[PDB]
Ligand binder design. Structure first.
Ligand SMILES: [Mg+2]
Ligand SMILES: [Mg+2]
Ligand SMILES: [Mg+2]
Ligand SMILES: [Mg+2]
Ligand SMILES: [Mg+2]
Ligand SMILES: [Mg+2]
Ligand SMILES: [Mg+2]
Ligand SMILES: [Mg+2]
Ligand SMILES: [Mg+2]
Ligand SMILES: [Mg+2]
Ligand SMILES: [Mg+2]
Ligand SMILES: [Mg+2]
Lengths: 252, 129, 151, 123
RNA sequence: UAGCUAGUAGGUGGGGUAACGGCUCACCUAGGCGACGAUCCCUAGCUGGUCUGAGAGGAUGACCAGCCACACUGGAACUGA
RNA sequence: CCCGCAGAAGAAGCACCGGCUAACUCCGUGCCAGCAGCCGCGGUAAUACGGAGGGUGCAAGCGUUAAUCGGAAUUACUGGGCGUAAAGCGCACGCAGGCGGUUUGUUAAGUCAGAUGUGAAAUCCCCGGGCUCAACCUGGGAACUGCAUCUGAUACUGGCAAGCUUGAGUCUCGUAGAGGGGGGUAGAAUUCCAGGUGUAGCGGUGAAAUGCGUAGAGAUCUGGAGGAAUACCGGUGGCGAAGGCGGCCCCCUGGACGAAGACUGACGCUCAGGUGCGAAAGCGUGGGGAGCAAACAGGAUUAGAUACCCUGGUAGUCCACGCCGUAAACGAUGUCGACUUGGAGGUUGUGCCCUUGAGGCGUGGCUUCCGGAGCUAACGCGUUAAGUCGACCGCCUGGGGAGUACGGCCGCAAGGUUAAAACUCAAAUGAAUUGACGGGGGCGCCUUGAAACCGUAGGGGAACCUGCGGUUGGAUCACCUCCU
């Protein structure tokens, strides 16, 4: 597990977040006081979840912070952010740092709240961030990056050396921000069709899509959509993936 | 495959000398006989002989002086990969003249000591001491 | 990039103003070393010697109460013949003058720029970018430099 | 390996750069101090180093070391530079010349003074 | 930097030069060149020499002597040995 | 140029002084900062900073920078390397190219000898001369390694001609073998189906859970299905170029080794380009799918767990036909040929002796482990060299950046392939020695219960996790001074 150590990049992250009132801000994983303090400072009042009840006591008893935040002590994947968006008057800014096994769940739970979230701002490991922003025709591309880029516009904020962290890992990591689309540029009939199309395709990414999505559609459907079935799964943009999803859903 | 019948006899001389053998033997050839003769003529061996019609064999009787081999160095400069020729004056000195080089001249094979005073350059076979 | 930028500014201000010099810029870089770069000017002049003085002072007066010291070293500098600049008042001294800018906003109609300062707003730099004109917030920029014409 | 290989391809003796290339083999070069600054080398290292960004007549701009005591030297001022490596510093391969065209001699110094650009005391 | 080339390669005949010659022009043949590096691109005037080196080598061609090319830039041509 | 006149009178500096490197001590200084080519110098003395005295060197100069050669053999013609330091193509065949046994004649291209013409002068070098000397100038010689031509010489090489049998290779007879290709077939085994008997459990783990069973599971009997693999022999064992090859029989088919002759007559070796073979993974097209199993899914575990555990499970794994073209494809060891102490085995021919049957003398081939000489940085290698050598090919030239960019080529795609540089560092590295080891382990003493990678494909909080198959290179880390 990790949390940051050096004021230069702490200050860079909290300043790049631009946390002020007129925003429905909520931290998750406040962790070490050093990086939760500047955001709880700049916001006149701030909401937070900590997963740990002991750290939640450490910070809630801290007079810089307990008087200056409202604090919650539970697994955030239980947490009803759609009601917190109502209680905070406008859709949320959700942000912070974590041990990040939970990362994959965080994204899906955030996406379960794409209406209730205004934006997300989080640190993550280099490979998963570069995947999350990957262009369709790259080895870094794939199913989770597809779903992420489907739900939101995604934007690297800044990148951080491993010696910057309190227990310094071996692994460089970056803060990234993302934005649930105000209207989906890719309208879809359902997301489960996307999720299964993408998993089938990426479970078979070395073979032709005739030997991946063509295990379900015909070649004449695919070419009828304007898609060459002789491509590989990692040639395919989210645009034609959502077109396939709509085709599956509407022809079923 | 075999591509230097002369380096073969010289390496047989070396290896036989190092193995303390009283004599060593080779498939004979006219040039080897002439070589064996000039190095007997400079005393580097006890004797040489040839035995048998049709296939021939040339035997070299290796010389040991008190406790040791007489030849201590023998090496061939005209690689079949690149031949070597020298003018009458350019005939080199082996061990500053203590040793011998073997020269095939257009008047036959001989020592460099013979060849320089004979005024003939030629092809150079090898050095010995 | 800096730690506690206001605290740092005041701790630096004490020897700067004791020397009667003026601050201009504070910036830190993180890399093979991690290091702090101070721009000071005084319009009578800054010599190498004036940098030497204030640097030996901050090398004591900051260090003894450092909020952080990771890989640390620092330098103090005159702001160059192409000068880094940081505030509304700076750009306001230099209205009509050619500039380059790089931004915390990072979007097409590219937020990396060459410009001539058109006018200053309380929140923004207005600038003749690309021979067009446009305006960028003091908060949506992050670094800028002036008279890049001088190599 | 074989002589036949050596005639098929001769010995490739390597080239090497000038390690001080912005001179173009001029014994010295002139420039202007595009900025000037002073640095501590390290967290415990107290020995301040005095350094300049300087643009040469040839349009190169490079770091150069300021040896010895202070000067007038300030950004519109002009400098003669020559080869010389500050071993402890990264890539600093150019020394400024004491007693050059905009550069004072070390007035105090009584030793090695032809390095430091300063004339015999007037006794 | 792998292929290159149509007066290109060769021939006959006409024209042309002080002189041989696609030098050039008509026809005629389909050649000619190149991985023993042509073609293409970069860089350079050349040499006796010079410096270094134990030597082999390496570097280099300022001065002096020989050869070459150029004369505001790009085109021609007059005259004359 | 000589001569007269007066007077030491008019005329010395610049580096450096810890070591390399000739030359040292006082003083301050505080790591203030200076010092610097490098190694490095310093707080309380510093022979290294600054100052002083003292010293050393060079001198009308002395230092600094730049630049070329040197040193540097550090591109290794002379004069280097490639098991592990960088380096032997994954393997093979083969064109061009290089190289080539042996005898005789012939030729005379190379080669050798001699001559002749030429090789500008100057410069260089030698021997002289001349400026008072020197620099400088200059006489004469030598030198100008060469080129051309003529003349001989004939060993060697090359050409030509003729042969030769030792290299190469054909034949006859045997021999051993998971060599390959094609086609049948068997006994185990798992799963599955169909019953039959039967009944509350089964299953799984550390324990659980998910899972399965009262629609009868599980178990056990019978009968059937289907796909895959060959228990044991089996080995420090054979075959194969390498990759690799293992139930059995047939069919086609490659190579090898021994035997004893016979035959051809140097037909040879190596090999840039070229061509082809080439594990595992993955791809292409169409089948198959038992068992296993990336991905995935679900249950657990853990601070978290993405792992490790379990219940599932797709691709894949199989087949035919295309492709890819890489592997620690490694003996990390290019191919071919000759030579050079021994010793104990293994395996497979063969000869002679067998008193037979065992034996015992030999004698090929292949192969394993020791080890002499020699070699090697050392480790080690060692007649199957890493010894001694001959011919040719491939490859390396500090560490990173980087087998990465870019371009070309190639590939269906993955990617492959060829392949930089800027930039950056004073190392990077191999072997081996001594302490730690340490966790010990045995009995204060001797001394160890203490995975890395390769290729490739996919997941992806990590470094990482997973699948396939290959390799073994199966781990540590390192502080207070010195002269004869
Ligand atoms: Mg004509
Ligand atoms: Mg030398
Ligand atoms: Mg000394
Ligand atoms: Mg070497
Ligand atoms: Mg190596
Ligand atoms: Mg090999
Ligand atoms: Mg011959
Ligand atoms: Mg002959
Ligand atoms: Mg397939
Ligand atoms: Mg396979
Ligand atoms: Mg590549
Ligand atoms: Mg293998």
């Amino acid at each position: 597990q990790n949390f940051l150590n050096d004021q230069f990049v702490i200050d860079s992250i909290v300043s790049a977040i631009n946390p002020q009132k007129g925003q429905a801000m909520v931290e998750i994983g406040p962790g070490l006081a050093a990086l939760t303090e500047p955001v709880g400072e700049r916001l006149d009042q701030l909401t937070v979840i900590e997963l740990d009840r002991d750290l939640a006591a450490r910070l809630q008893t801290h007079p810089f912070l307990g008087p200056k935040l409202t604090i919650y002590q539970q697994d955030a994947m239980t947490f009803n952010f759609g009601e917190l968006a109502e209680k905070m008057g406008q859709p949320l800014r959700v942000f912070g740092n974590l041990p990040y096994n939970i990362s994959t769940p965080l994204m899906f739970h955030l996406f379960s709240y794409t209406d209730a979230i205004a934006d997300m701002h989080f640190m993550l490991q280099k490979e998963v961030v570069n995947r999350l922003v990957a262009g369709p025709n790259s080895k870094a591309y794939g199913r989770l990056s597809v779903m992420a880029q489907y739900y939101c516009n995604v934007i690297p904020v800044l990148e951080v050396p491993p010696s910057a962290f309190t227990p310094p890992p071996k692994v460089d990591s970056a803060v990234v921000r993302l934005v649930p689309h105000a209207t989906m540029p890719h309208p879809v009939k359902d997301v489960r069709v996307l999720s299964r199309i993408t998993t089938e395709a990426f479970n078979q990414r070395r073979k032709t899509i005739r030997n991946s999505l063509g295990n379900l559609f015909s070649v004449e459907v695919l070419t009828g959509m304007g898609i060459d079935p002789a491509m590989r799964a990692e040639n395919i943009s989210v645009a034609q993936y959502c077109q396939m999803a709509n085709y599956l859903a509407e022809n079923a | 495959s075999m591509q230097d019948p002369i380096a073969d006899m010289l390496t047989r001389i070396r290896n036989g000398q190092a193995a303390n053998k009283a004599a060593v033997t080779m498939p004979s050839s006219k040039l080897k006989v002439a070589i064996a003769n000039v190095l007997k003529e400079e005393g580097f061996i006890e004797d040489f002989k040839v035995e048998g019609d049709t296939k021939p064999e040339l035997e070299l009787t290796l010389k040991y002086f008190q406790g040791k081999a007489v030849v201590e160095s023998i090496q061939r400069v005209s690689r079949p990969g690149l031949r070597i020729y020298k003018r009458k004056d350019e005939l080199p000195k082996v061990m500053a003249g203590l040793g011998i080089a073997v020269v095939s001249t257009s008047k036959g094979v001989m020592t460099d000591r013979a060849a320089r005073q004979a005024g003939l350059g030629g092809e150079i076979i090898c050095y010995v001491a | 990039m800096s730690t506690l930028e206001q605290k740092l500014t005041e701790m630096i201000t004490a020897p700067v103003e004791a020397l009667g010099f003026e601050l201009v810029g504070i910036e830190f870089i993180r890399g093979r070393t991690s290091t702090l770069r101070i721009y000071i000017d005084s319009e009578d002049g800054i010599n190498v010697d004036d940098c030497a003085d204030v640097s030996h002072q901050v090398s004591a007066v900051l260090d003894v109460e450092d909020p952080i010291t990771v890989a640390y070293n620092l330098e103090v500098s005159s702001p160059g013949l192409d000068r880094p600049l940081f505030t509304a008042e700076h750009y306001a001294r230099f209205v009509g003058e050619e500039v380059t800018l790089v931004l915390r906003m990072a979007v097409q109609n590219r937020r990396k720029w060459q410009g001539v300062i058109k006018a200053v707003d309380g929140e923004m730099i207005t600038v003749t970018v690309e021979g067009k004109d446009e305006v960028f917030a003091l908060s949506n920029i992050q670094k800028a430099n002036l008279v890049p014409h001088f190599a | 390996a074989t002589v036949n290989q050596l005639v098929r391809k001769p010995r490739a003796r390597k080239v090497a750069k000038s390690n001080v290339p912005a001179l173009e083999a001029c014994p010295q070069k002139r420039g202007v101090c595009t900025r000037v600054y002073t640095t501590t080398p390290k967290k415990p290292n107290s020995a301040l180093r005095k350094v300049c960004r300087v643009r040469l007549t040839n349009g190169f701009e490079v770091t150069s070391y300021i040896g010895g005591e202070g000067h007038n030297l300030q950004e519109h001022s002009v400098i003669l530079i020559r080869g010389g490596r500050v071993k402890d510093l990264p890539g600093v391969r150019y020394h400024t010349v004491r007693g050059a065209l905009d550069c004072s001699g070390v007035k105090d110094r009584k030793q090695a003074r032809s390095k430091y650009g300063v004339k015999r005391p007037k006794a």
